[PDB]
């Protein structure tokens, strides 16, 4: 039942984009936990989908220290499990509420931005951006949920990179407040700083 | 920072439907924690939205035992906070992964069902239903995450009621496995059993 994730061998299977696995890559790099970052092309996906017991990516393939292979699914469930394992998910339920309130807003905004890339909404987008900006201005701590980085600050990085690609010229005050969080993650999580500098430059 | 939710006065503001607040109502009734279940019409929403500091429902208005009024937002963040407070969120990160994997599947399926009511997909629906049915058949416990009810078993109830309204004649084997979970929640959580019997019969 306990996968012993600190020691376990970890392989992340996803496409060669940031997308919905970037948050997992950021948690593992923040924790300085090594993993195989396996980037799958859509040319390779049909054959991989046929031999493996899953139908969507990302999957985290865990090999426990005792040799047991377990395939984990559901991107945010994986990210939260890894964050809890490596001390990136707060210390009590009140802090976790702050994490999860912000992640609800930023996850929803991410999915709205993703859906508008090729469909053809600044109002629905503005609503999320105002809520995020408001929470960031009201906080009484350096990071979203307290004095130290948690999963919510890591997902802010995902959100910034998505707004830069999908909404480059959008000029909302929330962008500056998000960038402040990112600056603090880079300062305090040298594994993230190095990863962002070295990761593949991708469009999405 | 700690709202003292066991003792705090709680008012839930949402529309007079099950919708996205039913999970919160189920947690509180499972815990036998009293709350004001305030059901707002769309006739009343414009005026309420103008005087209060929020722009969407549900909101949980908490009055702590020391008299402090705090408005909580984000339906799933509220539900998880309440589940943690009342012992409905497992005991370790491995159990929580089981909760959150299942809630990812059932939340996604719920949102897909909601979006298809008036838009005009059995494939995308079938994918979620097969994954849910598969996890339910593979489990080595009475409930989704272990021997006792958690938030994931409560959201199964939300999913059943939604499939009954939106997909009455759909005949998938996952429906029976979901109904088994619901039967066990009713048996083991007398507060849920009573609530389901007494709650307003609504369309959505």
Author numbering:
A (entry chain A), B (entry chain A): 1 to 120, 129 to 212
Question: What does the published report state?
Answer:
Two crystallographic structures of rTs24GST without GSH (apo form) were determined at resolutions of 1.30 and 1.75 Å and analyzed. The second structure at 1.30 Å resolution was determinated using the rTs24GST 1.75 Å resolution coordinates as the initial model for MR. Moreover, this structure lacks the loop connecting alpha helices 4 and 5. The second region has the highest B-factor values in the overall structure and is located between residues Leu116 and His132 forming the loop connecting helices α4 and α5. In this region, the electron density is insufficient to build any model. The crystallographic structure corresponds to the apo form of a sigma class GST. These structures were determined in a C 2 2 21 space group (number 20), and in both cases, the asymmetric unit has a monomer with Wilson B-factor values below 21 Å2. However, the diffracted crystals obtained under GSH co-crystallization and soaking conditions did not show the GSH molecule bound to the protein. An analysis of the available space at the G-site in these crystallographic arrangements revealed minimal space for GSH to reach the site due to crystallographic contacts, which reduce or even prevent the success of crystal-soaking experiments with GSH.
